[PDB]
Each structure stands twice: as structure tokens, then as C-alpha cells.
Enzyme design. Structure first.
Site, PDB file in Angstrom:
ATOM      1  N   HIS A 158       0.790  -1.225   0.000  1.00  0.00           N
ATOM      2  CA  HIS A 158       0.000   0.000   0.000  1.00  0.00           C
ATOM      3  C   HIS A 158       0.829   1.286   0.000  1.00  0.00           C
ATOM      4  O   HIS A 158       0.860   2.005   0.991  1.00  0.00           O
ATOM      5  CB  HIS A 158      -0.951  -0.015   1.201  1.00  0.00           C
ATOM      6  CG  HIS A 158      -2.061   0.983   1.104  1.00  0.00           C
ATOM      7  ND1 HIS A 158      -1.882   2.327   1.352  1.00  0.00           N
ATOM      8  CD2 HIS A 158      -3.363   0.836   0.763  1.00  0.00           C
ATOM      9  CE1 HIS A 158      -3.024   2.964   1.168  1.00  0.00           C
ATOM     10  NE2 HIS A 158      -3.939   2.081   0.810  1.00  0.00           N
ATOM     11  N   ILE A 201       2.125   4.603   1.524  1.00  0.00           N
ATOM     12  CA  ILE A 201       1.056   5.445   2.051  1.00  0.00           C
ATOM     13  C   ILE A 201       0.338   4.670   3.147  1.00  0.00           C
ATOM     14  O   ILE A 201      -0.290   3.644   2.873  1.00  0.00           O
ATOM     15  CB  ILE A 201       0.005   5.770   0.965  1.00  0.00           C
ATOM     16  CG1 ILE A 201       0.638   6.564  -0.174  1.00  0.00           C
ATOM     17  CG2 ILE A 201      -1.155   6.533   1.576  1.00  0.00           C
ATOM     18  CD1 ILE A 201       0.999   7.962   0.199  1.00  0.00           C
ATOM     19  N   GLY A 248      -5.637   4.787   5.077  1.00  0.00           N
ATOM     20  CA  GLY A 248      -6.556   5.641   5.810  1.00  0.00           C
ATOM     21  C   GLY A 248      -7.384   4.860   6.816  1.00  0.00           C
ATOM     22  O   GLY A 248      -7.654   5.340   7.920  1.00  0.00           O
ATOM     23  N   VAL A 249      -7.789   3.651   6.437  1.00  0.00           N
ATOM     24  CA  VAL A 249      -8.587   2.815   7.317  1.00  0.00           C
ATOM     25  C   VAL A 249      -7.820   2.460   8.594  1.00  0.00           C
ATOM     26  O   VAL A 249      -8.414   2.314   9.667  1.00  0.00           O
ATOM     27  CB  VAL A 249      -9.035   1.515   6.602  1.00  0.00           C
ATOM     28  CG1 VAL A 249     -10.076   1.836   5.547  1.00  0.00           C
ATOM     29  CG2 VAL A 249      -7.838   0.825   5.960  1.00  0.00           C
ATOM     30  N   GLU A 294      -8.457   3.026  12.514  1.00  0.00           N
ATOM     31  CA  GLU A 294      -8.293   1.927  13.454  1.00  0.00           C
ATOM     32  C   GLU A 294      -7.453   2.408  14.641  1.00  0.00           C
ATOM     33  O   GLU A 294      -7.741   2.092  15.799  1.00  0.00           O
ATOM     34  CB  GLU A 294      -7.614   0.752  12.744  1.00  0.00           C
ATOM     35  CG  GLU A 294      -7.343  -0.473  13.598  1.00  0.00           C
ATOM     36  CD  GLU A 294      -8.600  -1.108  14.154  1.00  0.00           C
ATOM     37  OE1 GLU A 294      -9.592  -1.268  13.416  1.00  0.00           O
ATOM     38  OE2 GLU A 294      -8.592  -1.473  15.338  1.00  0.00           O
TER      39      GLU A 294
END
Ligand SMILES: COCCN1C(=O)/C(=C\c2ccc(-c3ccc(Cl)c(C(=O)O)c3)o2)S/C1=N\c1ccccc1
Ligand SMILES: [Cl-]
Ligand SMILES: [Cl-]
Ligand SMILES: [Cl-]
Ligand SMILES: [Cl-]
Ligand SMILES: [Cl-]
Ligand SMILES: [Cl-]
Lengths: 152, 147, 151, 152, 151, 152
Positions: free
Chosen positions: B48, B54, B57-58, B62
Site C-alpha cells: 500500500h 502510504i 486511511g482505514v 483503526e
């Protein structure tokens, strides 16, 4: 032009790779409208080592992630069709996420089905919404906005 | 401050889903400030994305949920390693999240979460994720602590 | 029982990540047969090198998944769902024969293990069957194991 | 055609990669006839995390996998010699496995020696058989038939 | 020149996960010094075994990170930010001496590397310095690097 | 008291675990004097994925780490023998490392033998030195001073 895609075609379109490629197979695809895909959940995944010990539970956020990738596959193919060459230099950023609700925990042995619909799309910005399903039941609901961009 | 070994005694999360490294500030039933370092030496980056690291975002969200979790455990039973170990945390809802700036290796990802509402094992919190004082993301979530 | 989920499987087999290849048991008949399965997804380490650009679940791991199913079968048949006793036992496989691979297994497949007791004499158990994906047989194999005291 | 190949040569011929490339070095090779190779077994392999906790044991099925790969290196070099170019376009499928017996458990610190001879070979189909050894003693025996296929 | 982010670092150093231990170069001065760092977080595979219930970033890795920084310094001092030439060169370490560990490094720490060129002759470059967390010295080391042609 | 130990004994003495337990077997052990042990180097290790792609080379600092662990096992047993209880209440932490010289690269297929002799010991402070060998040839050499500390 197709509506059924396997892991091979998914690798040629999405930039995601292990351990963040969370879509195994595309079973249905209507350009600029909807997509249905799924990811199998198995104990043999590294994320389970720590989520949680003795109690394997697929992370809720990764379900959202899986949905975004399904929508991302729908978005790319709707724009340029199945063109791996063009796709190979693009990435996908999350812009927003709203109204996500988790109803049932996902566990090893579950066939997590992603159902995404295009709520709105403008150029590179796609806004999809839908649900994650296991055995016909809704285990999760979510809305998200992702943007596809050319790797600068 | 609560360091990694204290966090381990409260949160049930372990590798590679324990995304909180230190708790710099905590106020019961009010708020919490914590952070997680981002380094290239993290497995998520292999995918990723290749050549373009990067932080997902998830996973940013979390990390905020976990920060919120620590705030709930400690507000509920204080720093009680004994009670904690019998529980796990379930994500109930996530809403209003927005990503403004990409997080990359070398970043110090700070979590700012305040309690919006809570009852029993159900806690709803909201706030932002910051890097160098700059807001790289905001979000709201409701988690549930259980046996 | 007849339906054991991952947690029940964890309390019986000693296998752990990344060598626990049985996600769920859909049916078990003491001393007769077992039907379980393991989902196959791209999010598995093995696919990193088998092979690049061409994810193909290793045939040896199908057999292994078949051995685990047989092991759960032999064990539950003798002591049933008993976590305590399971900790003191060992299911050591001695041989593998007549293994055939008909169609490759890939991410997205539900690998169903079908095993039955071909023979049981003392500590020696012999099981055999197939691994199936959507009703079609993708592999077959006969395996022999010996039950014993752990150490 | 050489007879002493190292991990660098092995990487250029076999399609296997981490964590499934189970052959570290080739010591003896006789085109279309036999091959001797080996894989060092160290505790530092991820596979030992779950096979098993507190007592490391190299999986038997993986020993058979290593013998199959040794066989594959022989087949490849037998058909095209050391040719990385045409070798990149290929993969190896397992067709059958027979007469595999497990005599001695393999553990961290063992030098797993693969001994294989060609039983039969026609085109891309290769039937090999032999043993896996450690310090001169046979720890496992097996027969298998692999197939080299265009990565089409 | 100025500061380099992981992206630039990936183009010069050949190291890749899980062995690239430098996240950012905040300061570089040709033939003189470098100041970089690596963020330490619990989410690193290494902490699984070093040690259970007690995460401590390895000392030899702090040293490895100092070498990579020192290596980065020597390479860019001669060729600057040149990716093509980078694939052409090899920077391995011949020696390491005067290594001292003072403070344990743990998840949450920003491991800052401070290396200066002690002396250099042709392709043999000698660097030395410290590893720092919050301004304090956690480790010290002197290393000698040899720059060669790849292959 | 013994001179030959296997991973099952090593695991009971050292606290190191995957992927930092870098000593597979001890073939020689003489209290307060020396220890000769080894670690197999196989391509099936995570480290090689990035060190380096298309050129597996076992990290020099890891060779040093392996030497330190053997020294640690040596230091502990010299004082308490093979005592799992006490072993897990103590930790061998290294204070300094000197005169480290890397002579030959280590690669998959190699048997990295650690040779450590006791240069000086007084209570909990241990100073050892030696080399890392592969096929009787020195590939590395170093000196370390360790401290046997309480684990709590
Ligand atoms: C810290 O020193 C590094 C250890 N070391 C090397 O790195 C050597 C050569 C080398 C490094 C990187 C590459 C390389 C080669 C091909 C490729 Cl394709 C790549 C890549 O793609 O990234 C990288 O070769 S040699 C060495 N150690 C020693 C130790 C003693 C004597 C000689 C060398
Ligand atoms: Cl993202
Ligand atoms: Cl959750
Ligand atoms: Cl196969
Ligand atoms: Cl086995
Ligand atoms: Cl250390
Ligand atoms: Cl090195």
C-alpha cells in the site's frame, strides 16, 4: 465489457498488493453503476495473529477497505475499461467514509461479499455505497468517496 | 504517560493490528492524546502501495478507535490489567471521516479523541489524527467492549 | 458435535499460523468421515511466491489440509471434543499415497476436504478422500497416521 | 551445463519465491538422469511459528515440495539448460504424488538433502523419485510427477 | 542536498523491507555529516521476538541503521542524488568498532542517526557518530565502508 | 553441564524468538571457556526479501547478533548450567561491540558456525570474542562485553 473477473484481472487493474489487496473475485459488474465482489476469510491470514489472539475476527476497517477496492475496480474499468497498462501507474486515495455500520462479526470460513453502487462520480472522484454480506446477510453497511490518481 | 507495555496490558490488540505506541495524555470520561510512529519497516507498506508508501486511511481510523478504546477501558475500570484481558473491542459504527493529508514513513501519527457519548460497554468518540500539528484526518466512531 | 468453528478447531489441532489449514468443519461422523474446508484468498503469504502474478495454492498444502482434517477426525472419534486430552496427543503422519491433482486451486476458492476412515487398527489410522471446489474433485489422496503421546 | 548451482542460479531458473522457494543449492546434476540439492533448515523460518509452537518440525508436505522443486530444476536445465529467458515464462504444476513415507522428523539445524532421479520424462512431463536425507540417513522418500507449463 | 524522504531513499539504497532502516534524511553535508532517523513502532515484525512481552529494538539494527545512513552519506557525497549510478554501486561495510549501547530503544521512539565522515580515501570511507532519542545518546559507533561496483 | 544442545534447549535458555533467535544448534560447550554453535542460512527467511532483492546476503550485523546470543548462552550456563527457571528471569544485554570485521559474505546454503571464547568474566560481566565461520573459513570476527541482567 465483462462482468466476471478473477484474481488475475484484479491484480492487473488495482495497485493494491499483499497484504492489502482484499478482493479475490468480481462476480458481477455494471459499468458506472454497480459491482459485486467477494473476499474469502481464512484463518491463514496474518491480520488474525493480532485480531485477536484466540478470537479471530476480521477487522471492521478492512471490510470497509475491501469495499473501497471493489468500487475502485468498478471506477477504473468504467473510465478506461480493462486496460492494465493504463492502470499500472494509478493509485487510489480514500477521501471520506460515512454511515458505516457493523451488524455481524466476520470470521474465518466466511465468504465476505462486497456489494457496491455508484452514488455519484465525477472524473476521478467516485462515491460509492453498499454492504458487505455473508451468506446473504448484511454484516456491514458503508458509504465512501475515493479518488483515483496517476502516480506522480 | 503510558508506554507500549502498559498499552499491552489494556488493549487486546496485538501484531499486526496494534496501532498505538504511546499515550501522552489522558483525562477520564473526557479525552485522550496518543500516537503511533510510521516507519517503512511495516508490512502494510509492501502492498500500500509498491514504490509509493502510504499508510492506509482505514488503519488511521483503526488507530483512533484503539486510542478511544484505551480511554474507555481506563474510564471504566481504571488501569486494571486483570479486567482488560477478558475483553475485546468491536467496531459498531464509523462516520464523518475525512482524509486531508497522506501519512507516510517518518511521520508521527498523533491521535486526538474526545468522548462524545457513552453508556455501559458502548462508547462513541470523535476527533482527529495529526502530523506535525496539522490535521491529516478526522473521524467519529462508536465501539463496544465485550467479554 | 458435527459443526466445529475455527475456535473449536484451535482447541483440538496444535497447528497454528501459517500451518493451520482448516477453517471450519461442516460435518463429522465418529469413525466414518469428515467434511471441512479452508477458504483460499489472495491475502495469504504463500501466494507471495507460488507464484508471482499467478496465485496457485500449493498442492502439497491441499494434501496437508487433508491430513489435518483426517487428524481431527481420528482424534474426535477417539475422545470427542476434548481440549484437555488433545494437548497430550500427537497425530503423526507416516505415509501419503495415490495423490492426484486434477484442477488448480486459486484465490476465491472454497477448498472442501472430504475424508473417510479406510482402516483403523490400534494407534494406526488410514484415511482417504478428496478436496473439492464447488462439487468438482480437484485432488485426491490416501494418508496413514499414528496416534501417540505428546512429549 | 554446470553441476554446482547457487541460490542466484536457482532464482533465475525456478519460478518459486519466498516463502515457497525451498531449494538453496544444487550440488550434483546429471541432465535427464539425477540431481542432488539441499535446503538448510533454520528456526528463523516463518513456517515454524505454527508447526508447531514450542517444538519446531519442518512439515513433511514441504519436504515433498522441496524434492519436487529439485526435480523441476533438473527438468528445466534438461530441456533448455541454464536459460533464464525462456525460464521466466514458465511455472510448474504438481500432477501426482505417490509412495511418500516419513521416517525421521526434520528440525532447525538440519541440512535437508534432496536426492532425485528421473523415473520417466516426456516433453514437459517429468516423473521423478527419490529421498530426502540428513547427515547421510533417509528422513523421507517420495515419488512425484510434475509438469512444466507456459505461464500463458 | 536539503532533506530526502523515504521515496528518495528508496532510489539510492538497495535495501528493502524488512531491512531498510532509515525513514528520512533531515540533514546532509557533502564529505561532512548526515542526520537522519527511523521511527520505531510496535508494528514491526522484529518485535515479535525481541522480545515477547518486552519490545526492544535490537542494538545491531541501530548499528545497521547508522551504517545505512553513513553509506547514504558517502554515496551522495561523491555522486549526489543519482539513482542510475546508485544501481551501479555497492556500499558494504568492512569494519565496525567502538560500538556502545547506553539506552534501550522502544516503540514510540524516533531513532535519530548522527554520522560524520571521520576520514575517507578513494572508495574507502570511515564514518562515526551516535544514535539519538530525544536529544540523548542511546548508542555510539564507528564504521568503515567500501564503495564498489555492483556485480 | 552438557556440550551439545538443540533448538529445544536453546529455546529454554534464550528469550529470543522469531525472527531474532539466530542460533539453531550448539555443538560444543565448555563452561567459562568457549562455545561453538551454528545457524543455518536458508533463502526461506524474511530478511532476504529486502537484503537484497536478486542477491541474498545474510546481514553482517545479524552475524554479530548470532555471535552475541551464543556468548549469552555461554555466559548463563557457565554460571547456572541448564536451568530454565532462572534463565527466564535473566537477560543477557550487550554493552559494547568492537573489532568487528566482515571478511566474506554469507549466503543461502551456508552453515554459519559461531566460535566464541571467554576473554574475561567476573560475576555478571562477560567479555567474549571469536569468529563466525563457514566451511572452516572465517567470514566474520568480533568482540563483545555482555551484562547478565535481571529480567524485571
Ligand atoms: C552492508 O554491506 C552490504 C553487504 N554486502 C553487499 O551488499 C554486497 C553486494 C551487494 C549489495 C547489494 C547488491 C545488489 C546486487 C544486485 C541487485 Cl539486483 C541488488 C538489488 O536489486 O537491490 C543489490 O549487491 S557484498 C556485501 N558484503 C560483503 C562482505 C564481505 C566482503 C564482501 C562483501
Ligand atoms: Cl487510503
Ligand atoms: Cl471490529
Ligand atoms: Cl502445485
Ligand atoms: Cl509434519
Ligand atoms: Cl539489543
Ligand atoms: Cl551486511
Amino acid at each position: 465489457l465483462q462482468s466476471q473477473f478473477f484474481i488475475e484481472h484484479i491484480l492487473q487493474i488495482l495497485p493494491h498488493r499483499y497484504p492489502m489487496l482484499l478482493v479475490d473475485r468480481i462476480t458481477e459488474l455494471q459499468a458506472n453503476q454497480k459491482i459485486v465482489a467477494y473476499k474469502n476469510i481464512t484463518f491463514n491470514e496474518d491480520v488474525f495473529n493480532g485480531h485477536f489472539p484466540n478470537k479471530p475476527i476480521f477487522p471492521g476497517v478492512l471490510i470497509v477497505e475491501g469495499m473501497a477496492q471493489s468500487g475502485g475496480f468498478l471506477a477504473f474499468t468504467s473510465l478506461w475499461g480493462f486496460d492494465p497498462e493504463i492502470a499500472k501507474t494509478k493509485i487510489v486515495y480514500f477521501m471520506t467514509i460515512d454511515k458505516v455500520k457493523f451488524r455481524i462479526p466476520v470470521t474465518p470460513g466466511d465468504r465476505l461479499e462486497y456489494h457496491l453502487e455508484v452514488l455519484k462520480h465525477k472524473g476521478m472522484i467516485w462515491q460509492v455505497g453498499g454492504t458487505a454480506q455473508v451468506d446473504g446477510k448484511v454484516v456491514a453497511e458503508a458509504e465512501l468517496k475515493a479518488m483515483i490518481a496517476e502516480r506522480e
